Amino acid sequence: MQIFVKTLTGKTITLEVEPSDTIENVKAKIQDKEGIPPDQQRLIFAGKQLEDGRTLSDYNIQKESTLHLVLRLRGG
């Protein structure tokens, strides 16, 4: 399944993922491609912040969906 992840800077990266993949896995994939540590990653889809433990299937994330990446500020 192709999905897109869009950053707040507007860059999109393309991932290949499956319904069985957890959000933890997706963040790992994003770190590989983009270099962002998972602990800083906050994903949003369908107006929901995505739970590391859950699968893309739990959120009904299908082909060509876009997830929004927001970074969580560590150290105000």
Q: How far is the CB of 18 from Pt ion (least distance, A)?
A: 6
**Residues in 6-65 at the binding interface with Pt ion, rule: CB under 5 A:** 10, 16
Q: Residue 27 or 29: which CB sits closer to Pt ion?
A: 29
**Which residue's CB is nearer to Pt ion, number 14 or number 39?**
14
CB neighbour list of residue 50: distance below 8 Å, 6 or more residues apart? 23, 26, 43, 44, 59, 67
Phi, psi of 40 (to 5 degrees): -85, -10
Nearest approach, Cβ of residue 61 and Pt ion (Å): 12
As measured in angstroms, the least distance from the Cβ of 45 to Pt ion is: 9
User: Which of 1, 13, 36, 44 is the binder for Pt ion (CB under 5 A)?
Assistant: 1
Read off the tokens for 28. 């790992």
Q: What is the largest CA-CA distance in the chain?
A: 37
Contact positions toward Pt ion, by CB under 5 A?
Answer: 1, 10, 16, 66
